[PDB]
Amino acid sequence: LYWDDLKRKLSEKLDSTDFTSTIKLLNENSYVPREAGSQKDENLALYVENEFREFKLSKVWRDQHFVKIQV
Amino acid sequence: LYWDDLKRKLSEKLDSTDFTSTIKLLNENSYVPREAGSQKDENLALYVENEFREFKLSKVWRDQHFVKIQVKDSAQNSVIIVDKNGRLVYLVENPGGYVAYSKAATVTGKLVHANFGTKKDFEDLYTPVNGSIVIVRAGKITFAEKVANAESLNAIGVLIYMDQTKFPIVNAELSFFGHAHLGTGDPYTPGFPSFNHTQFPPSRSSGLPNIPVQTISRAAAEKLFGNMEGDCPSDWKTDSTCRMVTSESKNVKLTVSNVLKEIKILNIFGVIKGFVEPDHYVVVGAQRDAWGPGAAKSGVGTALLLKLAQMFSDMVLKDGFQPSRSIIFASWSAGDFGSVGATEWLEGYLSSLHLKAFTYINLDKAVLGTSNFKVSASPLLYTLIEKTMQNVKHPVTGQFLYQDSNWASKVEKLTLDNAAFPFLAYSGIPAVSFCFCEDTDYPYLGTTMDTYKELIERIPELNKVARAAAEVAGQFVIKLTHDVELNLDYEEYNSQLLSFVRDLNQYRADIKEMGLSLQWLYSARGDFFRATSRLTTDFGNAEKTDRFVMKKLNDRVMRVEYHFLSPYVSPKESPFRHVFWGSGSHTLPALLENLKLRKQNNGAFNETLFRNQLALATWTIQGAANALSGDVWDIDNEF
Amino acid sequence: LSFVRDLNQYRADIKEMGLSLQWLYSARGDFFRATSRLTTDFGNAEKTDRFVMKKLNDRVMRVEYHFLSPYVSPKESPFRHVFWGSGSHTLPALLENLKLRKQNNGAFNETLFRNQLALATWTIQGAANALSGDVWDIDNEF
Amino acid sequence: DKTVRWCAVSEHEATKCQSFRDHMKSVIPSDGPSVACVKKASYLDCIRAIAANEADAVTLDAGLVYDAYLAPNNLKPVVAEFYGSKEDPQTFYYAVAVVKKDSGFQMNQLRGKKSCHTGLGRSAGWNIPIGLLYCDLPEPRKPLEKAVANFFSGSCAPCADGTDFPQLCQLCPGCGCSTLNQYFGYSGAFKCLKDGAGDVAFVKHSTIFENLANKADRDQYELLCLDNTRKPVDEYKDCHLAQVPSHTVVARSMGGKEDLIWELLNQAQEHFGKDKSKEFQLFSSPHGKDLLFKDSAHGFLKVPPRMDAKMYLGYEYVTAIRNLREGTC
Amino acid sequence: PDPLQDECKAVKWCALGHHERLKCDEWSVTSGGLIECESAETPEDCIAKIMNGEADAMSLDGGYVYIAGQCGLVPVLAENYESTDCKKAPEEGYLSVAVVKKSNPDINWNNLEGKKSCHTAVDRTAGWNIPMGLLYNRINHCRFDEFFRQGCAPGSQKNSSLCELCVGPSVCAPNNREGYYGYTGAFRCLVEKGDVAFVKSQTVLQNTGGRNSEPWAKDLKEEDFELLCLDGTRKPVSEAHNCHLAKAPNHAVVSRKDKAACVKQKLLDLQVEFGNTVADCSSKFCMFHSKTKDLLFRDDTKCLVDLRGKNTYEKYLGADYIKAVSNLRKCSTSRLLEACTFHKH
Amino acid sequence: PDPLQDECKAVKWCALGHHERLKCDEWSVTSGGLIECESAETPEDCIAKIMNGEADAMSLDGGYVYIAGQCGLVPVLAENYESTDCKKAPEEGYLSVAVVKKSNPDINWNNLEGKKSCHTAVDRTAGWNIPMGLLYNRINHCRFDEFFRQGCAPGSQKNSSLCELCVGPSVCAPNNREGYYGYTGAFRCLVEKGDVAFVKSQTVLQNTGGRNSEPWAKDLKEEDFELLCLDGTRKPVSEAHNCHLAKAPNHAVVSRKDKAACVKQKLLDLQVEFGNTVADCSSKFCMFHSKTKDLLFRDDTKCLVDLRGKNTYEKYLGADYIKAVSNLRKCSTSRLLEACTFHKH
Ligand SMILES: [Fe+3]
Ligand SMILES: [Fe+3]
Ligand SMILES: [Fe+3]
Hints:
Chain A starts with a helix and ends in a 17-residue tail after the last helix. Chain A is mainly α. Chain A has helices at residues 3-15, 19-25, 39-54. Chain D is an alpha+beta fold. In chain D, helix 4 (123-133) packs across helix 11 (315-325). The radius of gyration of chain D is 19 Å and the shape is globular. Chain E has helices spanning 18-31, 43-51, 62-70, 125-139, 144-147, 182-192, 203-207, 260-274, 313-317, 319-327, 335-340, and strands spanning 11-16, 35-40, 58-60, 74-80, 94-101, 116-119, 150-152, 196-200, 225-228, 234-236, 246-248, 252-255, 303-306. In chain E, strand 1 (11-16), helix 1 (18-31) and strand 2 form a beta-alpha-beta unit. The chains are: A mainly alpha, D alpha+beta, E alpha+beta. At the A-B interface, loops of A face loops of B. The site of one fe (iii) ion (FE) has 6 residues of chain E, from helix 4. Chain B: This is Transferrin receptor protein 1. Chain B: It comes from Homo sapiens (Human).
């Protein structure tokens, strides 16, 4: 396909996507005070991880790390 | 054409090439005392340059450089025995040669004799050098190191002489030339190239002695010992005559007056464009300068370089040889001062050479005898050295170079004094370096006696020998080009890495007293193993026809060597970053070497240093893995 | 070029000091050609030779990374990019020190500058030798 | 002395090549240059073959000369065709747009018509006319093939990808890139119009004269001029789309045998040029038109030393080709 | 290009070699980017860059103006050498002479065959076109490298006789990286190795009397040189007026038709703050002043003057000059000129 | 291979996962390179490496010995568990049992349908072949993941029921990166989530009475568990002898015919300095001792004993075992086994 095609497609796809809903969903008490390395944090993390899997995209993994934060 | 073809051709071509003539030609007064940056030097330089042009090979250029070399000042350097006042006996000698980059000063005091430049090891002897001049034999290590250690023990002044046993030279009134720089290249442009003196003119001490170093004639050595009470041990695989300490009654004074002298080094190149990966080269070098006539130190090399360049070009035009990757011959200069020529070239592609040069061969001191066949290189060229020593027959013995009685051949590590060392330890280019060596190193080497005569008087069939050397060098080139797959042993590093892990496990106890888990290291070592296993697989599944998929692989191979250079140390500070063959605290060997001290229960062990050493040395290896593939984005996300 | 320009506003200071500032122009140029070849090789290559294209795109892919001072350790100064980084290796940082020269006070570290320029030059230079020049850049004269 | 491996595109060229080989053998001495014939399916295979040392020479239309110059092929032009007469050799020719009499449309009314092209990327058949219509094309204009396919209501554009752009082969199913496609080239593009498959044929000023011997048959056609008028076919000098550089023989930049190529062709034109021989003709054939060299050529001229495609083609023409490729309106 | 306006944001200048580049950069900074710099290693390459809009403008000697014109560029503004009043029309041109050493007693116009020659560069007016064409009309062949025994005519074939006297790092290049390149270079060439130099009439004066402080010229004296007159005699250098080869059109700035106007206007403006008027050139920037010799413009350039209708290379160079360069067409070795004359329209 | 001699320089061992690798490395250093280490993530991959000489040897449970044999490898030496006298013949085999919690009153042999199960790994003798085959002969179909409600049988399909109890970082892998992998892992699985574990008879003892110091097992008591007898009853663990499923051939070392001898000899020798005899294992290296559980060999391994003529997998495993694994052939899901049985000779 050519640019116009991709441009046009990408647009209509953008024309039919509720961003506001997801910006809200990412506000439910399920993951609200999603501080760094918190449970909520880890919650949304797994949400994104699964969503990606659900998106049926190719390989999708996790990246673990142990850094010192201050509280 | 196929290997047999190239092998057979290259042979007959080698069967009809007079190496002895050119080794002689490079001795005519036209270019004899071809010191670094001298006129003669510049003469031969243009000779090679033109010869290359005459060879009708593709592009050929020049490489200019202005580095600071050290020379003998008009004022005479000398050693003189003298008590707590004046010289009683006589001025031992006014040395005919000198040790470059030596501290320009003059001091006097006691004179200890630490066999073989202290070797760093030998320093663990009875008599202390705590504030006193020292004598050492030219041998096991490099002047640079000999001096370095001497000073590390707080000594001052160092004399280097060629004893009789080690150096069976009839003449004892003979003097030789030295180096003294604990590094490679101009000692004021570490990692980055040099300029004018007018611009960027620091003095020194940037990895230089700071202690006078003077070469002394055996005769002079004789006399020194003459004024010494101590008695030379049998431990020293030497022979009678030397003492250990000067007779208390009096001491000795060393006076060296040398001066820096900006010269213009001239590297001469010349390539043979490839046909498929024209931009991946095989650097073939050869020192061109020398103090004396250096028929050995520099003759044989340049001799081979030329004759060897003459052949491949010919093979390409007349014989139909189509090297898949370009070859680039290079005659460096100012090599007697630490490969100053070749090094400052590398200094120039501080982070891209490996993207260009995939292997560096070196013809320096290729022919020195006819007994042994020493070989030093990066494990990446191990199988090439092997399979080739199985194709080349000794010049004297009708038999093949390879000792059929083993399955594991001997390969030596590259030393600070080999142009190949920088290519590998600084630029991350795998490099080989053979030698038709002898149990005893050539004597006339660093002296005015390195004549084409005394050479051939000591090696009758020099032609056949040089031919062999030119053959192993040739095959390396044919081999590193003939085929479409870049043939480097990136596997040998798995072993090299496991060996480390092993030796390290011998301190699992110490590792335990410290909270260290040492688990991340195994992961890296493993994360890397897989990387190689994929590469080693992807190759097999790829077809030698998809110029694309092959290029993508060969490039990965070409990364292997370079990526073992600690990406956590600055070239400007520690130029030899290669964790395996470099020099510094980033060095893998250096890690164990510090840990060994743990057991000594003393403070010799720097714990904070170790902690990092391990920590980084881990991520170095780790990275080497993530860079060598793992299909990108290595997914060992668990751990 | 913008750098070179802003730097020429101190050609006076550069002169009081023995500095030739000639090597920098060479790099800046040795780099310009590099890009001119790449910009050319592309045009002459066909969007069908997956091979010749891959060899080019890779060069393009090197451009940004190679402007990271290969003379400073990530462990010490992580933002090595001579242009957008942070540290004395920073190109902007060079001018920023030179500006102090005029203040006639000690605020200007001369030895620091000397290097800053020296390396910042070879950084750019290298960026060039890495971005092609058909490899082995042959400006052997100079 | 020695052999020049000529790259022949398909059967007909292959047949003429073999006759070319045989006739030169009979006149050239044992010490003269000789021809060997290498058959490929398309000009693009001939370009790869020369680069790969499988062949040595091939004659290309100037628009394809540009492509041949590009990496990784890097071929260079070595010998040029000339037209006109030996008396006043012309190293260029005119791109025209031929249509039938009273079909009732001008150049500004091409949208929706059916087009016959000599071949994708060729000067007269493609580069010039598509270059002139570019902004009349609907967006998106990338890829070009797609905008062109949407502007006309069907075409024959030889060498185009019929899988990707089926409307481009609507008049010549498959878009065959050789004379096996009867609508390929100058004469094929003209046949596409004459047969009634297309409304316009993008060819050269001599095409119609090479195809219709009677003036009365030729009076049934006209040319579209850029001012939106039409003129008779004799009036091409005042009604043409552009002047373009001659077709040229290309060769490798290294080990290319350019000396022998010139030697072979210079002798070939002496023995077998226009009206020279009753046995064989370099510039015509019973097997087809424009095989190996154009039938309208009268001879050859050697290109100056080391001239590259860009210099050969000239800034203008190169600019036009570039501007078609990225091109901004 | 819907109803648009203003492409005249900045003018991109094409500079040869390193030095011209430096000067251009300096001119860039100071203008606040009104002048942009592109570089190339040869005049022909610079003209090519401008032809294909990789650059917009450069100044050129008449000989190169001819090539530029055959290649479709147009002259925009001329360099005037005689007056500081920039509203003056372009001069009729500079004097082209042949200079020898007083030391050398035997050389004369009718004696050149065999001697050693020095030329600004091939294809330049005073260094080549004038003298070579006038010699050509005498020897009626084109192997100038066989008429002189040896020489330095930058831009010639690396291995002809005519490159044997050159020296500059880049040996024989048509740029500053050749020492004997240009009006000055050819003079030095004369001083050091040649028997004859072809240069402009003001050259001796600009390089004698300590006016040129380089080692090779600091002690030179105007009286040490003579000119060759067409009639076979010799005269002091102060006599060019009555002892010159011909007149030579002034160097001129060239561009493409599309950008001529833009180019003009920005040059005329920039001249207001950077031309003759600048009292000191080490403090503020000077167009017509050069660190070395003749970078981007001739150092003796006074004004860039409007061409008053001579907006065409045939018109600006003038008939006589055209007629002379044409007679030499058969000896061209210019790759760019053959390129620009290939198309038949 | 002209008249040659001695390929037995070093033996290359294939190790699963990280831990086995570490142990191997350690064994390497200390031997002075008589043992070389290659690694893989699964038993099948290890067998493949050995098939194609990427490695030479590994020790394996009987179930995997079957696969190895169908793939052309041979047994070389057996692991003996009952005696320290390494000259003894191989034992008839270990006891295979089913263990439950005393807590749970209702579970029994005839009751498994529906419960939660724990298995060493798929394809192992005590964890799978014995129990699954004996159940198969009862349900006459192969959806074991539908007979049990849920489980942890490492090496099963990532998304079947039988992977739902697994935990180890690498969930459900047939290696140590799965927590519930092996004799021990399956026991823990029982302790923490399952109703039945299929393991060897000595397992309970090796993991109760503080003999296993991990948090999960330190306070466990032998008396907390029972065995399932085939007749439907339950018995204390001290009664395996009269309450086991079947006998299971000992784990055995495998290689290729070409290298069997080499492998043998070096193992027999290495055993002399690194086997049972080593009085302390934290000072000197111990083959049969493992940092974790059962790396390279079973930790209860006493001797590696010569096979005395049972140099063939059919011969070593024995008829009964072969007959049992064959009956389960139709449920295999082993990709390597299908591979090894493709060729028709
Ligand atoms: Fe055409
Ligand atoms: Fe002029
Ligand atoms: Fe088992």
